[PDB]
Structure formats: structure tokens, C-alpha cells
Amino acid sequence: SVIMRRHLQRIIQQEQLINSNEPGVIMFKTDALKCRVALSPKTNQTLQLKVPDELQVLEKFFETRVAGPPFKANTLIAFTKLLTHILRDCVHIMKLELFPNVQFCLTIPPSAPPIAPPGTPAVVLKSKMLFFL
């Protein structure tokens, strides 16, 4: 968790928007819900974000899939470089991947169906916007 936190600050001081004030939490001022990630206070063993219940599903997806047990940098690159109706489409695909994966959705229309969205990712060895359409 601490090494993902350091990777996150290294990402934010390279390439999104860097505005914050806290004790430990890191805040990233990307538009459509500027984010703030920190470890939990009940267990100290897990990172967590605070950034429309699709977004709650998005923070649980970040907790189980992004800040997660391999702790590799490029998945953090993928999720953070991802972060505007792509929010709705992605979190629909993420409530899918929570209920029913390494990819998120954007809408070529206003829709992210079973098929047929503008699906994107930032891949394993690549980490750049790659598509299913």
C-alpha cells in the first residue's frame, strides 16, 4: 500500500493536477471528482479513495483491483490515466466486473451495453489507451 502511494505521487508529479492539503492523504485535482487516496483507519492494511453510487462501486474497484496484491505500477498507471461520460460507462462495466476486468468502458453512443461501447484500457506492458469497438 505504501509503495502504491509512492507510485501514485510519482505519477501525479509527472504527466494530472497536483493540489492538496492533508496529513498523509494524496489528492489529485482531475476534473469530474478530484480524488483523495489514503490508507484506512480501521485496518491500516489497505488504501482507499474518496472522490453516483457507481462512484462508490468505482472506489471499491480501486480497492480490490488497482491497489492490490501484485502491487504493480502499470495498473495504477491505467486506472489513474483513465481519470467524461466514460465515468458512467466505466463504472457500469466495473459494477459488472464486481458483480459478475482489467478494462473500463467509455460510450461511443450514450450507451455501454453488453456489447457495443467505446471500450478502452492501458495495457499490461503498454499502458496506453487501447480499444474495443
How do the strands and helices of this protein lay out in sequence?
Layout: H1 2-13, E1 26-28, E2 35-39, E3 47-50, H2 54-66, H3 73-82, H4 86-98, E4 104-105, E5 119-120
Antiparallel strand pairs: 1-2, 2-3, 4-5
Helix pairs in contact: 1-3, 2-4
Summarize this entry quickly.
By secondary structure, this protein is an alpha+beta fold. The protein is built from four helices and five strands; from the N terminus they run H-E-E-E-H-H-H-E-E. Belongs to the Mediator complex subunit 14 family.
Molecular structure report:
It is found in: Nucleus. This is Mediator of RNA polymerase II transcription subunit 14. This protein has four helices and five strands; from the N terminus they run αβββαααββ. It has a three-stranded antiparallel β-sheet. Strands 4-5 form a two-stranded antiparallel ribbon. The radius of gyration is 14 Å and the shape is globular. With 133 residues, the chain is α+β, with helices and mostly antiparallel strands. Helices cover 36% and strands 12% of the residues. It has helices spanning 2-13, 54-66, 73-82, 86-98, and strands at 26-28, 35-39, 47-50, 104-105, 119-120.
